[PDB]
Write a protein that binds this ligand. Structure first.
Ligand SMILES: CC(C)C[C@H](N)C(=O)NS(=O)(=O)OC[C@H]1OC[C@@H](CCCn2cc(CCc3ccccc3)nn2)[C@H](O)[C@@H]1O
Ligand SMILES: [Mg+2]
Ligand SMILES: [Zn+2]
Length: 813
């Protein structure tokens, strides 16, 4: 055994040992209990970043822990390969997105292998290969026939200078983020998943997920946004009917979740597209301009609530069916056409947004709810104004004294008897629009025939292969400019026809890849029945919190679709969910000759104990140390994990990632922290080396410890206490930094114990054999090497250390 720890001399050898034993290559073995541990698969962007290393180390800790506990562990990896990155790289580098992708995959795969993750590489998938995406085309065609996928006109943001469609997030002040050109709102036919048909199931099945973080479930519930409310129809006043047709001349229909406050409505608000707005705006230029501004807005969903709320009066009036009040209709920018009726009532005394709206425009506020003896102030909002649990109705005529639910029902009865309203359930959830006007993505398996319509491609003809010999040019989506692709024959009639040229939202590939890993070479279906039956659902999912809403909702939706197709028989894809925090680093800059800042990468900086400033490492010239934030290309503060691996080895990288912070917490890059991790591995190495240098290995202590000295009993107590703590940290708390600290304390106590005697050496052997197995999930290369110097058995067959209960009983006084 070499005296000094040298990662480059041990890490390739350990990886070859595991590869040869095929310990991570698993089959559907009915004799061993399955465990499916899955980390969110990466975009093959070029090289790993530190967020990747943290995610896949967490996954590997849990996977190796379960492996040592006797599970048949599947830990698969693959590549979320479609999307805009490869297209931008294509336009920047004049290479094919496919060529760029496959080169990146090969490089990043080598990186992952060098980190020693216990991955079943025989299950690798790449979502840009036709062997993968043919199956989501297949599912598309099956749901299209059932109407679960459908085609309808929708509105997109068109950038006329970049000649491409933009999401709301890429529209700034009504202009394209890169071009700076004014966006055009365009109506185009697009394809949608009817996810609203599954809203109730997606909402209610969240309650099954006892091992999901409560915040993720809360975010999903709020996104789905089910409400139990009331439809209410306000008769249009006789003087307000000019320009109105049909039922819009008879009544203004609204949806409210607070019909118990209907006696307190003081005005109503309609969307810019509402017929009442159209009729009112006919002779009023200010209304026309307000409507145009609303239609030209491109507010992203995450920003909708922060938008400043604005409105204009219409001079039109409706009548409250409960009390007979004549209320003025306003057009407001927060009322969205397509949500319910595109019209709401406003109760400023008991809804905070209505309070601020009415306070701005000096609209009336009428208290109809009282909470105890609390004072109502029409000039200042108080939280109890919105209370639904402990209020009773006041100023509400024959409804006074009722609580929320009782008043809800009485209003429902009153309105229904009059024909002026009825209870109604609504959902914020929109249908999922999947058409993308992009090249590097899964082709939509539809053929347009002037005789037959929009026709799904037959299953025998799938996949519709995306041609890979394409270099996007930036003057429009390439597929629409390639007749060699889109000119085809109709599969129903054989007539001249055109393939659909839009591609699929790349969320589609990540909505089912966890099932494909179960049988990634299965050519007769999305996933084979035998594999789906064996692996079931993902036992443990690990990924960033930024995916808590869309990706997880989409995956749960696809799981229920595939269940309803007979492909799987789980209701939920992921049993346990661990969401990791971001990785952050200090930033560095020098000021510009243009009064700005240029951001320097930390690897090109050297600091100069009490630290005082830093300078550029190539050419000494002091830079400004700046604030710490998420690693990004924006502030050029990304630390290349490859340089960390090159300088210290994979185990140091993994140990620092797991020790620096709990997974949910932000992990701050620290040079001293990395050095501390490496120093700890050197200490572990030296501890075993020095132990073996003073006598070589012995049989580890086991059994009755009567007659052991007090000092050795105390060390065995610490040993088996540490095993219990680490087991609980890996298995239950999923806090790995405290597990590492626990082993450090065991080694601290070992260091203070005289283990020179015969019984001392046996206990020392027991301590070291446990310590290297307790740390193997985190730093497997060094623990594999040290284990083999201590013991001739296969470490993974020795298994997870057991707690000796007898070592935890204390002497009787
Ligand atoms: C299931 C699919 C939908 C997943 C999808 N293909 C995807 O997210 N793929 S992925 O490849 O993006 O990420 C793969 C995983 O691992 C990294 C995590 C980052 C956490 C935040 N995060 C980022 C950073 C730093 C990033 C950075 C660093 C240095 C330079 C430049 C950038 N720190 N924390 C991700 O949430 C995810 O679990
Ligand atoms: Mg349960
Ligand atoms: Zn046809």
């Amino acid at each position: 055994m070499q005296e000094h720890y040298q990662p480059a001399a041990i890490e390739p050898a350990a990886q070859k040992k595991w590869d040869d034993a095929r310990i991570s290559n698993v089959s559907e073995d009915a004799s061993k209990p399955k465990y499916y541990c899955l980390s969110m698969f990466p975009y093959p962007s070029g090289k790993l970043h530190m967020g990747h290393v943290r995610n896949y180390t967490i996954g590997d800790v849990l996977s190796r822990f379960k492996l040592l506990n006797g599970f048949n562990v599947m830990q698969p990896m693959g590549w979320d390969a479609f999307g805009m990155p490869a297209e931008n790289a294509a336009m920047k580098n004049n290479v094919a997105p496919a060529a760029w992708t496959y080169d990146n995959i090969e490089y990043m795969k080598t990186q992952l292998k060098s980190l020693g993750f216990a991955v079943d590489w025989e299950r690798e998938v790449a979502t840009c290969k036709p062997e993968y995406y043919r199956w989501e085309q297949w599912l598309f065609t099956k749901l299209f026939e059932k109407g679960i996928v459908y085609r309808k006109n929708g509105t997109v943001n068109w950038d006329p200078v970049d000649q491409t469609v933009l999401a709301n997030e890429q529209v700034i002040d009504g202009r394209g983020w890169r071009s700076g050109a004014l966006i055009e709102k365009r109506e185009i036919p697009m394809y949608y998943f009817k996810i609203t048909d599954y809203a109730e199931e997606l909402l209610n099945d969240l309650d099954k997920l006892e091992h999901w973080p409560e915040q993720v479930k809360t975010m999903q519930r709020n996104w789905i946004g089910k409400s139990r409310g009331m439809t209410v129809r306000f008769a249009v006043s006789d003087d307000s009917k000019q320009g109105l047709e049909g039922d819009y001349a008879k009544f203004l229909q609204v949806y409210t979740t607070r019909p118990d406050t209907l006696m307190g409505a003081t005005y109503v608000a309609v969307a810019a597209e509402h017929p009442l707005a159209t009729a009112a705006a006919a002779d009023k230029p200010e209304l026309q301009a307000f409507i145009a501004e609303c239609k030209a807005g491109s507010v992203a969903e995450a920003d909708m609530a922060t938008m400043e709320k604005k409105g204009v009066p219409t001079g039109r009036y409706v009548v409250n069916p409960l009390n007979g009040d004549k209320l003025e209709v306003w057009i407001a920018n927060y009322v969205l056409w397509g949500y319910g009726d595109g019209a709401v009532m406003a109760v400023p005394a008991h809804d905070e947004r209505d309070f601020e709206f009415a306070a701005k425009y000096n609209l009336p506020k009428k208290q109809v709810i009282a909470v105890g003896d609390n004072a109502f102030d029409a000039n200042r909002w108080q939280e109890w104004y919105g209370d639904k649990e402990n209020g009773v109705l006041v100023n509400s005529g024959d409804l006074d004294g009722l609580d929320f639910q009782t008043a809800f029902d009485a209003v429902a009865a009153k309105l229904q008897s009059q024909g002026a309203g009825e209870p109604k359930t609504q959902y914020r959830l929109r249908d999922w629009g999947i058409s993308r006007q992009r090249y590097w993505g899964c082709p939509i398996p539809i053929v347009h025939c002037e005789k037959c319509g929009n026709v799904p491609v037959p299953a025998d003809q799938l996949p519709v292969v995306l041609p890979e010999n394409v270099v996007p040019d930036g003057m429009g989506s390439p597929l629409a400019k390639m007749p060699e692709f889109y000119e085809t024959s109709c599969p129903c009639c054989g007539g001249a026809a055109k393939r659909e040229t839009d591609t699929m939202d790349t969320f589609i590939e990540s909505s089912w890849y966890f099932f494909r890993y179960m049988s990634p070479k299965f050519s007769d279906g999305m996933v084979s029945a035998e594999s789906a039956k064996y692996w079931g659902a993902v036992d443990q999912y690990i990924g960033g919190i930024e995916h808590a809403i869309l990706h997880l909702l989409y995956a749960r939706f696809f799981t229920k679709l595939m269940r309803d197709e007979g492909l799987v028989n789980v209701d939920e894809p992921f049993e346990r969910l661990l969401t990791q925090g971001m990785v952050v680093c200090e930033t560095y800059y020098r000021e510009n000759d243009k009064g700005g800042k240029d951001w320097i990468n930390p690897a090109d900086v050297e600091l100069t104990g009490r630290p005082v400033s830093a300078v550029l490492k190539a050419d000494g010239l002091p830079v400004v140390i700046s604030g710490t934030e998420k690693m990004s290309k924006s502030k050029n503060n990304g630390v290349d994990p490859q340089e960390l691996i090159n300088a210290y080895g994979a185990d140091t990288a993994r140990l620092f990632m797991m020790f620096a912070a709990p997974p949910e917490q932000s992990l701050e890059w620290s040079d001293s922290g990395v050095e501390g991790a490496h120093r700890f591995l050197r200490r572990l190495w030296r501890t075993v080396y020095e132990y073996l240098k003073q006598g070589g290995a012995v049989k580890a202590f086991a059994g009755n410890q009567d007659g052991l000295s007090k000092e050795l009993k105390d060390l065995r107590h610490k040993l088996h206490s540490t095993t219990a703590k680490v087991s609980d940290d890996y298995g239950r708390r999923q806090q790995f930094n405290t597990a590492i600290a626990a082993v450090m304390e065991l080694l601290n106590q070992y260091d203070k114990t005289d283990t020179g005697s015969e019984q001392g050496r046996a206990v020392a052997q027991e301590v070291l054999e446990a310590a290297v197995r307790l740390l193997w999930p985190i730093v497997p290369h060094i623990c594999e090497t040290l284990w083999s110097e201590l013991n001739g058995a296969k470490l993974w067959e020795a298994g997870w250390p057991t707690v000796d209960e007898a070592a935890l009983v204390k002497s009787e006084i």
